[PDB]
Symmetry: C3
Amino acid sequence: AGAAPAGGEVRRVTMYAERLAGGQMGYGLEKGKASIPGPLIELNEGDTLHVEFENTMDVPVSLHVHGLDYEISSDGTKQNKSHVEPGGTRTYTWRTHEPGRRADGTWRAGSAGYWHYHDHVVGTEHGTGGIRNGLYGPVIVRRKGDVLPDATHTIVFNDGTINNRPAHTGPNFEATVGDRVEIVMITHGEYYHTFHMHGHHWADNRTGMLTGPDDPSQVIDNKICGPADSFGFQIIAGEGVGAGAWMYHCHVQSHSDMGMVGLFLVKKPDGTIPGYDP
Amino acid sequence: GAAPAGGEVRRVTMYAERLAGGQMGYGLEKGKASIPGPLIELNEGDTLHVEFENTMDVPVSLHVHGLDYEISSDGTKQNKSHVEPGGTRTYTWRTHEPGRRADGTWRAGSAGYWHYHDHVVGTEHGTGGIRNGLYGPVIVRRKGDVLPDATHTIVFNDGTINNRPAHTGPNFEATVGDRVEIVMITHGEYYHTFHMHGHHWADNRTGMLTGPDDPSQVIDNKICGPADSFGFQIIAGEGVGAGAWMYHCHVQSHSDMGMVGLFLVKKPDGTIPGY
Amino acid sequence: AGAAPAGGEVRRVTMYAERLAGGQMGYGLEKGKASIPGPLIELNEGDTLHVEFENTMDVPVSLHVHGLDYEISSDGTKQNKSHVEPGGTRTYTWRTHEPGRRADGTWRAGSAGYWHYHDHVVGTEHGTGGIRNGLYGPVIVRRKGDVLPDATHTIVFNDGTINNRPAHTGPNFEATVGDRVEIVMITHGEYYHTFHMHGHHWADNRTGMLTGPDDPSQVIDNKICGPADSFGFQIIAGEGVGAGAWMYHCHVQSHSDMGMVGLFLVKKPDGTIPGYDP
Ligand SMILES: [Cu+2]
Ligand SMILES: [Cu+2]
Ligand SMILES: [Cu+2]
Ligand SMILES: [Cu+2]
Ligand SMILES: [Cu+2]
Ligand SMILES: [Cu+2]
Ligand SMILES: [Cu+2]
Ligand SMILES: [Cu+2]
Ligand SMILES: [Cu+2]
Ligand SMILES: [Cu+2]
Ligand SMILES: [Cu+2]
């Protein structure tokens, strides 16, 4: 229960790229704790982030980010010699800005939104191998006053997997009726997808909720997405529909049949989920 | 005509039936199933009880997008909310108006262009049921929405329009000046792009800009994937006049192989120049 | 540069459809100077354009435009005999209109937007051959008061090529830090794509810029698009990021690996590009 403050802090974090089991690779904030997706990075508009990056891996790796402000030296491409050699370290810097009126009279959009970072050098100079291996994660940049959620869950459609998981293994997320639940939805790889949530719905705009009665944004429960698309939203769990095992899945039929499905488990306050019997 | 405030409790019967050629369809009366299924129209606030009967020999279900439904009306075998052969079940859809929540945020209303479809035939995601034709449109209107003269539903289902054989339309007729509503739904395996000659719409809830402050892009071509639904109203012939106005998927092999139809816009005298 | 005036002029131009080398086909405003993409057409809402069209080729050809007001005789399809026979001429007329209140109290959208024209009869009755061969070009319709760019660049994803160019050959576009640069981005053919620009971002609305602090449009740097989609935007070159070779590419991973890539070369005021060697 709260809102994002105004930003402008200089922030620091250590990040590592590490091999994981089965040919996978992940980003982590502590050694041996790499995850797919990588760790959620949250900033308020105006914040600067210095990522003190370490490549623990035996092959080059990079960190490229969407939406945020970065100089070429933090592009994270071989083009710009801003990759990281094996065993090497590098500080990537991401800046963000508030919205404001330009001198030419136009309005400059702020950095706020649902973004993501990923590798750009593993396998190919566009990171095809590193992204396939799991080198991706979410970045939320919040505008002053944006509503904060009770929990945030990241769902990545990477080719024919969710979060590089084996088919038919979710992931599942739990909430209680009334929780404000934030979804970060990212796509990667070769395929288009359509993200669908049973029992819930959001506005197709920056925050996923209408700004008020004048917001003409479409309200949807199904959204087409392709490689490197990112969007997000906040829903009220069970709003107008109640507790239950609410499925979410890609709606491309073969993709849902092959396992691109998971559960949003919404509990009443007493913890019950009517009719859930897996 | 403009939509009123909703709030009524409404009722329909619906049946799932086998149709010719391994197809299956929904209908509001027995032996009268259609593909797409019947158009369901509600005002925000309405409740709909669908007294549903599975007349076929395989399980079927009814799952809806966008509307408010309890988990018992999800329409999946996972919840045992499917309908066994010969069975019946009442699925209930509710709808709500927009309004501010107690937490201070704005809750969107139910209004928009939605759809219902099977979730259990062939697979536990309805792949065979959707392929066979078990889909239909639902429109929920907001108080004050302008009402159209006609509503036409165009479903891109895999490589087909409305499960029709290639190059068989469908076509739709209007008169210049008619306010025509299009419901545009996609199902199956493929992405598509919907395109209309001679006409354009806003990429927002209603397909019409709300006024001069609406920044929505105006378009005549829209990418869509399985279970996407959108809709819009056009003034037939507005700024362009009468004629056989093509619509089609703009994916080139799809338009070449048959996902094309005609919006046949008539002069007042009933004729179409150039057709 | 400034702002678009109110429209309402009646304009005329010659257009030719011509064969080019390698089995290609292009539109041009001067005989012998066709190009792929075709010439940029720019109109202010309310303007009329009479295109005096000549088919110099040995196959029937047409001119079909998106978004604009055209009568059935300027549809440019075989079904109403508005194609152009080999050697023939025809006047295609495009009209446009301002937004306005209808007498019924509803709001009529204006013609403004990022549009395109292309063939509709070469090879198939949907122009599959003509489009593949290069018969496509951009149309911009501006609203009174739209900000004018310093330059406009057109990027067409046509099947697996950019602008029918051999793979890995760009195109590249040059700008100086602070330039107001306009991108028109058109897709054609068989495939879906995702368009991504490093170092830059835009608003997913008509103009690509937020109208002000009440515009809830998502700000993005990645956008899914399919055959005959058109969108555009304006960016301030290097805004918040500095000079550099800023890659743009399809983000479908194999497409970026197969050469659907180019460079937005943003130069320092001294004309140099840091970290880039030509
Ligand atoms: Cu890139
Ligand atoms: Cu998918
Ligand atoms: Cu659903
Ligand atoms: Cu990327
Ligand atoms: Cu489902
Ligand atoms: Cu298609
Ligand atoms: Cu067209
Ligand atoms: Cu569905
Ligand atoms: Cu066409
Ligand atoms: Cu591509
Ligand atoms: Cu077209």
